[PDB]
Structure formats: structure tokens, C-alpha cells
Design a protein around this motif. Structure first.
Motif, PDB file in Angstrom:
ATOM      1  N   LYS A 107      -5.402  -5.716   2.014  1.00  0.00           N
ATOM      2  CA  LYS A 107      -4.345  -6.370   1.251  1.00  0.00           C
ATOM      3  C   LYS A 107      -3.637  -7.448   2.069  1.00  0.00           C
ATOM      4  CE  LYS A 107      -3.331  -2.518  -1.881  1.00  0.00           C
ATOM      5  NZ  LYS A 107      -2.464  -1.339  -2.158  1.00  0.00           N
TER       6      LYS A 107
ATOM      7  N   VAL B  60      -5.954  -2.793  -4.518  1.00  0.00           N
ATOM      8  CA  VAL B  60      -6.906  -1.734  -4.172  1.00  0.00           C
ATOM      9  C   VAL B  60      -6.255  -0.372  -3.875  1.00  0.00           C
ATOM     10  CG1 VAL B  60      -8.460  -3.495  -3.259  1.00  0.00           C
ATOM     11  CG2 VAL B  60      -6.964  -2.228  -1.714  1.00  0.00           C
TER      12      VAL B  60
ATOM     13  N   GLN C 179       0.825  -1.197   0.000  1.00  0.00           N
ATOM     14  CA  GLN C 179       0.000   0.000   0.000  1.00  0.00           C
ATOM     15  C   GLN C 179       0.860   1.247   0.000  1.00  0.00           C
ATOM     16  OE1 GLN C 179      -3.448   0.655  -0.008  1.00  0.00           O
ATOM     17  NE2 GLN C 179      -2.763   2.785  -0.175  1.00  0.00           N
TER      18      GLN C 179
HETATM   19 MG   LIG Z   1      -5.484   1.458  -3.774  1.00  0.00          MG
END
Ligand SMILES: [Mg+2]
Length: 666
Positions: free
Chosen positions: A444, A666, A420
Motif C-alpha cells: 500500500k 488489499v 492497513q
Molecule cells: Mg487487505
DNA sequence: CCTACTACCTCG
DNA sequence: TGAGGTAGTAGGGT
């Protein structure tokens, strides 16, 4: 819990006999064209003929008498220059109950609208759009306000108006006059003499008079030969590149270019839009001869509010950062700082520690004391982290170059670690940004942070997404939610109908692992965007493994707008239309303009429509990486979209190094 | 019908 | 790279 709503459509008068009985006209083209060429030709001929005429079959249909049409003429398509001759064949009465005839009638209606708009005073007209008011102006530009209209025929033989308010940004200047106001150079630009567009690269002082142009005359001489300059000596050389291949540059003139303006160089509250829809509907209604516009009302239902939950009930996925997760096993997270600083900023560590404390889960926070610029030692620190139960890594870094973002993500992912990014500088006040980043990091790392409490028809819901624009021939992604959440990819040009079944099958397999059974009934979601037959194999296999199923297509457009007759506007609105199809207003916030309902079609299965709406709308809340706003599309489709975007971005058509319970994308 | 881009505004 | 939807713009020789 039912209510009533307005759609942005308006009923007008029924068609008169003369409109039901339009002129039919045979067409001949010399030379005779092929098979995959005749239709565009016929449209061109219809525009050529004039009047309110459209294509019907291999001929034409018209509401204008043959005596005011252009009957013979000349035309040019893809090099082949044709001659056309029209032959009146009498008047063919069409029935609206027949779809083909109604389609022709609706085309004639769109034509009628366009022609009536063209002969209209005081307004600014473009296509089927009409603009009535100046909303903004500037040294050389303008923002007009109006609406995109549509006009068709119902199966009952009556006119239907559709109105949706819009703005239009227009430029009143040529590129040279635009530059002479000191405005910056636009990225895209247009020929003042036609509709072709280019990307503006730069300017050049290689004077227009003496600029040799491939055998013969100069820039100026060329453009003046085609009568474009029409007296005026054009501006300075503008270096422009056709959008296709930006590699090769092309000379042009600033006096023959027109800026293509974007908002870079205007949204409406629902109540305002409702109003202006009404107003413009009334006005167009008066200006046409179509009668009194009467808005179409529809029966709607208020779906139940979903009950999200963590370690306690919740309204949005962010409060789980205070209240605790749904499913939290032990986790180890790791920090990697690409800037100069060291260690975790204390507010992140604190939020993580609290969230895990309030969940009874253990949390270990490791700090990678290495830099991505050390290839070997960095990969060693990486594997050492991974071999100690590290499940995800958070990256503190300045805004990364795009290519470097992709490279870093790829490198970490291949050693087995999802990642991330959170940008620096970073204040504790920037709450939503680092809370969002934290939710992303948690998702994640494999965590289930929120889940839906309730009874749902389908135990498993899977949504698909294709790599190509119109088939699964290139793959290739699927996402599913019970309820735990999983993703699936294909395995390194294939028969399109096989990929879909592959994804679905593996999905079912993962469900067979974590749940120990096959699902009773399933929910299959596709964003349309593909022919149905790519699912035939999956449907049959589904019916062969003894699994109950529903297939529902979920489209973002074609539903128009939905307003309330009285009172406030809320989500969870389910509007049934008829045969297996329905509107669904999944998402809305006041400051966020006016909502755009999703349009959903029930292609297979036979579950009650309302039930499907209920579960789909509920899955709208299960996306765990936003945390303050819910996605418009069901979690599986949203996630699938994000997944293929990330696969295309990282180029990981071969990635078996990460678990399928972790949502790395994401 | 669909995507992509930037701008805007808030933070179920 | 925070993310959401709704906006606008574009796209499906010189
Ligand atoms: Mg993202």
C-alpha cells in the motif's frame, strides 16, 4: 515437458438410431403468448408432457413415444393460465456435428439421466445429483455423500458422463421440532408446502388461533384453508421476513417451516476424489444402460516454475521480509493505535527495519499521537504526517465495526493516506497474520516487494473488472503489471463500450510515463462475465495506436477437474483442448482439497497458446499481498476484483488524492 | 456461467 | 480487520 491426465468425464456408448431419430412435436398454446414468454412456457410444457422430452425450437423433441406423453393439458405461468395441445410431427434425425441439433440431443440426454435417476433404488436423488452414503447424522439432521452428474452428447454422436463428488446437508425436521431439540434458530427457513424461502426473524406467542390476517380469517384458519396443516394444529407464531425487503415482517407458523441448514449449524483430498469419481462413474454406468464408462484422457504440459525474486531469489513474498525487496526507495510508515497502548510492538519494527536494511533503503517510522475521535486535530496530525513523506499508515485496533472500518479507511484515504488494519490482541506467534499485514502495508505504501525474472511476450498485462454483474455500464476498474503494478478507475451510467477503452488508455498512459514508451505486445485479461463487444472499441483503438495485443477470457468454472494418470499432482499444468481454449491448473496444495482448473479462451490476437499459458500462470505469483499462498487467478484479475470490491465498499468514485502506484485496496 | 455468506485448514 | 483455496449454503404471501 508433457504428461497425460484424466478429466472427470467418462465415455459411454454411441447413440442408437432411435435416439438419433426422436419424436418431433408441434405445440399450440391457447391463448397465444408473446415472444419473450414462449420459451419458458415450452419448457414448462415439456415438463408437463412427461417422458424424456425437451424443448426444440418452438416445439418439442422426445425419446418417449407420444402414446405415453400427456398430449393435452392445462398450465399456469405469470397469471395467464394456458391450455396446451401437442401434435406429433414425425421423427427428426439430428446430426451431432451440427451444434443446434447436438444441443437438443444433450438436453435429451440430461433428461434421460434425470428420469433414470428418479427410478433408482436405495439411493437419495435430487435433480442430477445422486447421494449414496450417510456421512454424518445429528439430532434432526444429516450429511449425505454422493456426486453431481451431467450427461451430454459429443459431436461424434456418443454419450458423455461427467461426475463430481459432493456432500449435501439435509434437515429431517420442521422448524418446531428443530427448536424442540434445543437447537438455535436458523437464519433461513423454507415453506414445508412449497419451495419459497424466508429469513427467520424471531418467534411470537401471539397465538395462531387469534391473529387477524388482512380482512377475514386467522393465521391457523388461513393455512388450514389451503389444506397445509392437514389435520395437525400448527406450532407457535414464527416471525419471518421475505429475503428481498427485510424491513417488513410477516407472520408464519413453526409447524409449517423447515430449517435451511448451513455448515454453520467436508472437503476431500485429491486422491480420494479421483477414487470416488471412478467408483460412482462405474455404478451409474451399470445402473444406466449406457455401457462401460471410460475416462477421457488428455494431453497436458508441465509449465516451468516461476522464478520470483527480491534482493535475492525467493519462494514466497514473505521471505522478502528477511531477504529484502525488489524495488525499495526510501519510505516513511506511520502507526496509529485505536486501542490504549502506545508505540510499535517490537517485532513489527524489527521486521520492517531488517527488510529495509537488507535492501539498502532508508526507513522512517512515525507514530501518530492522535485519535480518530478528534476530527480536526486528527486531520492536522494527518496532514503533518503526509507533509513529511509518510506513504502509508498501519492501524492497530480491536476488531472494528464494518461501518467504522469503512469510515476510517475513507477518512485516511481522502487526506492522501492508504491504510492497513491489524487486529489486537496480537502475539508475536501469530506470525502469518502480522507478516501478511506487513506485506499489505508495504504494498500500500507503493513498494515493489517481488518481481518476475524472465522473458515475457507481453511487456504489459492488464486485467479488467466491472461494477455491474454483466456490463461495464457502471464501470469500472483495471489493474496492470509489467514489472511495476498500477490501477485505474473511471471518472464519476455510461456507454458500456467506452469505459473499457478509458481504463485501457489511461493504463497505457501510465506505462508511457514510467516506461517512456508504448508496449510492444500486450496481454488483455477479462474474467468473461461480459459480452465481447464491450471490448471492440478498445481492440480497434489498440490496432490503431499500433499496439500488438491478445484478448483472453479467464473463467473459474466449466473446466471440470483434472487428475494425473500416475504420480503426484502439481501446478503449472497446461491442458490444451482445441480451438483457442485451454485448461490451466494454476494453484494447488495437498491439504487444500482438490484443485479446480481455470478455463481460458483466446478471443483475439495470435500468440502461441502455450506462451499465453506460460505468462498467465506466471502472473499467478505476482500478487504480493498474500505472501504464503498464491492466488488462483492472475494478479491483474485478482487485483481488479479487490479494487472494485473496495470502491463499492468505500464509495470512492472520486479519488484523485492517492497515487496510482500505491495499492491501497488489499 | 456468476456473486455473496460461513467453516475449515494451513501458511509455495 | 491476514490471506489463500475449497468446501458447504443461498441467490442470479402471511
Ligand atoms: Mg487487505
Amino acid at each position: 515437458g508433457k504428461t497425460e491426465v484424466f478429466l472427470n468425464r467418462f465415455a459411454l456408448r454411441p447413440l442408437n438410431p432411435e435416439e438419433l431419430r426422436p419424436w418431433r412435436l408441434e405445440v399450440v398454446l391457447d391463448p397465444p403468448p408473446g415472444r419473450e414468454e414462449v420459451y419458458p412456457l415450452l419448457a414448462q410444457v415439456a415438463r408437463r408432457a412427461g417422458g424424456v422430452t425437451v424443448r426444440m425450437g418452438d416445439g418439442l423433441a422426445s425419446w418417449s413415444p407420444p402414446e405415453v406423453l400427456v398430449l393435452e393439458g392445462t398450465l399456469a405461468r405469470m397469471g395467464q393460465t394456458y391450455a396446451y395441445r401437442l401434435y406429433p410431427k414425425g421423427r427428426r434425425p439430428l446430426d451431432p456435428k451440427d451444434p443446434g441439433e447436438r444441443s437438443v440431443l444433450s438436453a435429451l440426454a440430461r433428461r434421460l439421466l434425470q428420469e433414470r435417476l428418479r427410478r433408482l433404488e436405495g439411493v437419495w436423488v435430487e435433480g442430477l445429483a445422486v447421494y449414496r452414503r450417510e456421512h454424518a447424522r445429528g439430532p434432526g439432521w444429516r450429511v449425505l455423500g454422493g456426486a453431481v452428474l451431467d450427461l451430454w452428447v459429443s459431436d461424434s454422436g456418443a454419450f458423455l458422463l461427467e461426475v463430481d463428488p459432493a456432500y449435501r446437508i439435509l434437515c429431517e425436521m420442521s422448524l418446531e421440532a428443530w427448536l424442540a431439540q434445543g437447537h438455535p434458530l436458523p437464519k433461513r427457513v423454507r415453506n414445508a408446502y412449497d419451495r419459497r424461502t424466508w429469513e427467520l426473524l424471531r418467534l411470537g406467542e401471539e397465538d395462531p388461533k387469534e391473529l387477524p390476517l388482512p380482512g377475514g380469517l386467522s393465521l391457523l384458519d388461513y393455512h388450514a384453508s389451503k389444506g397445509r396443516l392437514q389435520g395437525r394444529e400448527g406450532g407457535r407464531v414464527a416471525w419471518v421476513a421475505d429475503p428481498k425487503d427485510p424491513r417488513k415482517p410477516i407472520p408464519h407458523l413453526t409447524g409449517l417451516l423447515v430449517p435451511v441448514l448451513t455448515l454453520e449449524d467436508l472437503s476431500l483430498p485429491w486422491e480420494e476424489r479421483r477414487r470416488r469419481t471412478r467408483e460412482i462413474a462405474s455404478w451409474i454406468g451399470r445402473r444406466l444402460g449406457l455401457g462401460t464408462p471410460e475416462a477421457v484422457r488428455a494431453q497436458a504440459y508441465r509449465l516451468s516454475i516461476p522464478k520470483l525474486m527480491g534482493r535475492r531469489a525467493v519462494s514466497k513474498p514473505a521471505d522478502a521480509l528477511r531477504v529484502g525487496f525488489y524495488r525499495a526507495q526510501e519510505t516513511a510508515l506511520a502507526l496509529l493505535r485505536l486501542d490504549g497502548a502506545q508505540g510499535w510492538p517490537e517485532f513489527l519494527r524489527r521486521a520492517l527495519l531488517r527488510a529495509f536494511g537488507a535492501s539498502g533503503a532508508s526507513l522512517r517510522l512515525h507514530t501518530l499521537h492522535a485519535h480518530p475521535s478528534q476530527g480536526l486535530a486528527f486531520r492536522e496530525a494527518l496532514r503533518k504526517a503526509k507533509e513529511e513523506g509518510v506513504q502509508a499508515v498501519l492501524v492497530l485496533t480491536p476488531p472494528m465495526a464494518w461501518e467504522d472500518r469503512n469510515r476510517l479507511k475513507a477518512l485516511l484515504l481522502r487526506e492522501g493516506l492508504p491504510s492497513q488494519i491489524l487486529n489486537v490482541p496480537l502475539r508475536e506467534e501469530e506470525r502469518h497474520r502480522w507478516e501478511n499485514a506487513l506485506l499489505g502495508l508495504l504494498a500500500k505504501a507503493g513498494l515493489q516487494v517481488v518481481a518476475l525474472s524472465g522473458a515475457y511476450p507481453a511487456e504489459l498485462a492488464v486485467g479488467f473488472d466491472a461494477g455491474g454483474r454483466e456490463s461495464f455500464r457502471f464501470g469500472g476498474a483495471a489493474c496492470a503489471v509489467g514489472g511495476h503494478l498500477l490501477w485505474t478507475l473511471p471518472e464519476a451510467e455510461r456507454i458500456p463500450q467506452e469505459v473499457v477503452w478509458d481504463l485501457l488508455e489511461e493504463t497505457l498512459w501510465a506505462f508511457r510515463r514510467k516506461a517512456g514508451r508504448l508496449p510492444s505486445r500486450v496481454l488483455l485479461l477479462r474474467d468473461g462475465r461480459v459480452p465481447q463487444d464491450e471490448f471492440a472499441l478498445a481492440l480497434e483503438a489498440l490496432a490503431r495506436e499500433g499496439i500488438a495485443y491478445d484478448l483472453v477470457s479467464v473463467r473459474k468454472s466449466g473446466g471440470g477437474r483434472v487428475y494425473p494418470v500416475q504420480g503426484r499432482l502439481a501446478d503449472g499444468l497446461y491442458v490444451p483442448l482445441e480451438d483457442k481454449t485451454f485448461l490451466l491448473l494454476t494453484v494447488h496444495r495437498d491439504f487444500r482439497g482438490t484443485p479446480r482448473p481455470l478455463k481460458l479462451v483466446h478471443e483475439a490476437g495470435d500468440t502461441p497458446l502455450e506462451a499465453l499459458a506460460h505468462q498467465i500462470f506466471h502472473l499467478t505469483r505476482l500478487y504480493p499481498a498474500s505472501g504464503f499462498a498464491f492466488p488462483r487467478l492472475p494478479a491483474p484479475l485478482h487485483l481488479a476484483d479487490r479494487l472494485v470490491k473496495e470502491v463499492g465498499r468505500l464509495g470512492i468514485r472520486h479519488l484523485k488524492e492517492v497515487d496510482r502506484e500505491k495499492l491501497f485496496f488489499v
